[PDB]
Design an enzyme around this catalytic site. Structure first.
Site, short mmCIF file in Angstrom:
data_model
loop_
_atom_site.label_atom_id
_atom_site.label_comp_id
_atom_site.label_asym_id
_atom_site.label_seq_id
_atom_site.Cartn_x
_atom_site.Cartn_y
_atom_site.Cartn_z
N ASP A 8 38.39 -1.25 -37.80
CA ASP A 8 38.03 -2.40 -38.44
C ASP A 8 39.29 -2.60 -39.39
O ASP A 8 40.09 -1.52 -39.46
CB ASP A 8 36.89 -2.23 -39.40
CG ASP A 8 36.51 -3.50 -40.19
OD1 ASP A 8 36.08 -3.32 -41.36
OD2 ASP A 8 36.70 -4.69 -39.69
N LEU A 9 39.33 -3.55 -40.10
CA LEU A 9 40.70 -3.54 -40.92
C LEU A 9 40.34 -3.62 -42.63
O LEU A 9 40.81 -2.84 -43.22
CB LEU A 9 41.40 -5.00 -40.61
CG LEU A 9 42.89 -4.86 -41.20
CD1 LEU A 9 43.76 -6.11 -40.72
CD2 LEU A 9 42.88 -4.64 -42.64
N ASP A 10 39.72 -4.84 -42.86
CA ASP A 10 39.06 -4.98 -43.99
C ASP A 10 38.26 -4.09 -44.76
O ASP A 10 37.15 -4.06 -44.00
CB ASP A 10 38.76 -6.48 -44.10
CG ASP A 10 39.64 -7.42 -43.84
OD1 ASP A 10 41.02 -7.48 -43.99
OD2 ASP A 10 39.02 -8.24 -42.83
N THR A 16 41.36 -4.72 -48.56
CA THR A 16 41.32 -6.37 -48.50
C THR A 16 39.91 -6.75 -48.33
O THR A 16 39.70 -8.30 -48.40
CB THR A 16 41.95 -6.75 -47.09
OG1 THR A 16 41.83 -5.62 -46.26
CG2 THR A 16 43.45 -7.26 -47.20
N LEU A 44 28.11 -10.35 -46.12
CA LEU A 44 29.29 -11.15 -45.75
C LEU A 44 30.13 -10.27 -44.98
O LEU A 44 31.04 -10.67 -44.30
CB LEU A 44 29.85 -11.98 -46.78
CG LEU A 44 29.05 -12.96 -47.66
CD1 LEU A 44 29.89 -13.60 -48.75
CD2 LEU A 44 28.57 -14.05 -46.53
N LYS A 45 30.37 -9.10 -45.47
CA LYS A 45 31.59 -7.85 -45.02
C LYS A 45 31.25 -7.95 -43.53
O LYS A 45 30.31 -7.98 -42.87
CB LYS A 45 31.26 -6.74 -45.62
CG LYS A 45 31.60 -6.50 -47.11
CD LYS A 45 31.62 -5.13 -47.55
CE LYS A 45 31.85 -5.12 -49.17
NZ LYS A 45 31.94 -3.46 -49.49
N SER A 114 39.17 -6.09 -35.45
CA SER A 114 38.80 -6.90 -36.65
C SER A 114 38.52 -8.40 -36.41
O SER A 114 38.99 -8.65 -35.40
CB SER A 114 40.15 -6.88 -37.75
OG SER A 114 40.17 -7.71 -38.69
N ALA A 115 37.28 -8.65 -37.13
CA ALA A 115 37.01 -10.22 -37.15
C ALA A 115 38.07 -11.27 -37.78
O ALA A 115 37.89 -12.36 -37.41
CB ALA A 115 35.66 -10.25 -37.65
N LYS A 145 30.89 -10.43 -34.79
CA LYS A 145 29.96 -9.40 -35.65
C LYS A 145 28.81 -10.08 -36.26
O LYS A 145 29.07 -11.03 -36.77
CB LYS A 145 30.82 -8.43 -36.45
CG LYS A 145 32.11 -7.96 -36.03
CD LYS A 145 32.86 -7.07 -37.00
CE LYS A 145 33.90 -6.22 -36.58
NZ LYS A 145 34.85 -5.64 -37.53
N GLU A 169 34.05 1.61 -39.62
CA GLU A 169 33.65 0.28 -40.27
C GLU A 169 33.22 0.53 -41.62
O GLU A 169 32.82 1.71 -42.13
CB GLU A 169 32.55 -0.21 -39.48
CG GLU A 169 32.76 -1.38 -38.41
CD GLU A 169 32.86 -2.70 -39.31
OE1 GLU A 169 32.71 -2.77 -40.54
OE2 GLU A 169 33.86 -3.65 -38.64
N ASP A 170 33.25 -0.53 -42.55
CA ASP A 170 32.82 -0.56 -43.97
C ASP A 170 31.83 -1.44 -44.17
O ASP A 170 31.21 -1.52 -45.33
CB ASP A 170 33.88 -0.95 -44.68
CG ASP A 170 34.18 -2.45 -44.74
OD1 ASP A 170 34.43 -2.77 -43.56
OD2 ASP A 170 34.23 -3.12 -45.69
#
Ligand SMILES: O=P([O-])(O)O[C@@H]1O[C@H](COP(=O)(O)O)[C@@H](O)[C@H](O)[C@H]1O
Ligand SMILES: [Mg+2]
Length: 221
Positions: A8-10, A16, A44-45, A114-115, A145, A169-170
């Protein structure tokens, strides 16, 4: 052994998620919705730009026009994009760069799930593009997601079955997406937010190849 790691990125690769939160909160307050605080933000994540906006609008009794909806999403993105212009390699989360190097040395595929449509730009900002074997385009999947589509696509892009992959993932939505993809999730954040049913680490320094191996050898079923 697992053969791929789907990133995942953020909130995983770099802080981010904090920028998305601040940008969404600013947008919400501009239209008089003050419900976007850290607690609400957990919902929202991991969710797509439009899905995030709608979740925020769901806090209001009246609806906005299609025209305003489109402008709001663009407004938030334009702000977010300005916010990330100075991101640099120094912003990469602890352990992430080493993990990427270790995975490549061990011939384990690396894919971005990542979305965020701003994902490629961010990887370039952090000098991480070269480590990725593939970047799953979030605009190509039919469902975002929590749907598993993006993780399934990331795995396919590197020629590895999701069942032989680990997803990092976070977010609540992202963890659900990993679960339904067949890959093994290892979340980063607090137990109160992500659950106690899967492996969760407090910060990314815990994301070492050694630990991923430690967890994988312990997978159920
Ligand atoms: O967490 P990951 O990397 O899936 O990324 C996700 O990307 C979404 C769409 O991003 P953009 O508006 O830049 O297209 C964001 O709303 C969400 O907060 C973020 O967690
Ligand atoms: Mg995230």
């Amino acid at each position: 052994m697992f053969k791929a790691v789907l990133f995942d990125l953020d909130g995983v690769i770099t802080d981010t998620a904090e920028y998305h939160f601040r940008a969404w909160k600013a947008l919400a307050e501009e239209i008089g919705i003050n419900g976007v605080d850290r607690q609400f933000n957990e919902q929202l994540k991991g969710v797509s730009r439009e899905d995030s906006l709608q979740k925020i609008l769901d806090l209001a009794d009246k609806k906005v026009s299609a025209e305003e909806f489109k402008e709001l999403a663009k407004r938030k993105n334009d702000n977010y994009v300005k916010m990330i212009q100075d991101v640099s390699p120094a912003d990469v989360y602890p352990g992430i760069l080493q993990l990427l190097k270790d995975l490549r040395s061990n011939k384990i595929k690396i894919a971005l799930a990542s979305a965020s449509k701003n994902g490629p730009f961010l990887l370039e900002r952090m000098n991480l593009t070269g480590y990725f074997d593939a970047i799953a385009d979030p605009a190509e999947v039919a469902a975002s997601k929590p749907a598993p589509d993006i993780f399934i696509a990331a795995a396919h892009a590197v020629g590895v079955a999701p069942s032989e992959s680990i997803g990092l993932e976070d977010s609540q939505a992202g963890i659900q997406a990993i679960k339904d993809s067949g890959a093994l999730p290892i979340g980063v954040g607090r137990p109160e937010d992500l659950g106690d049913d899967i492996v969760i680490v407090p910060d990314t320094s815990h994301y070492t190849l050694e630990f991923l191996k430690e967890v994988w050898l312990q997978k159920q079923k």
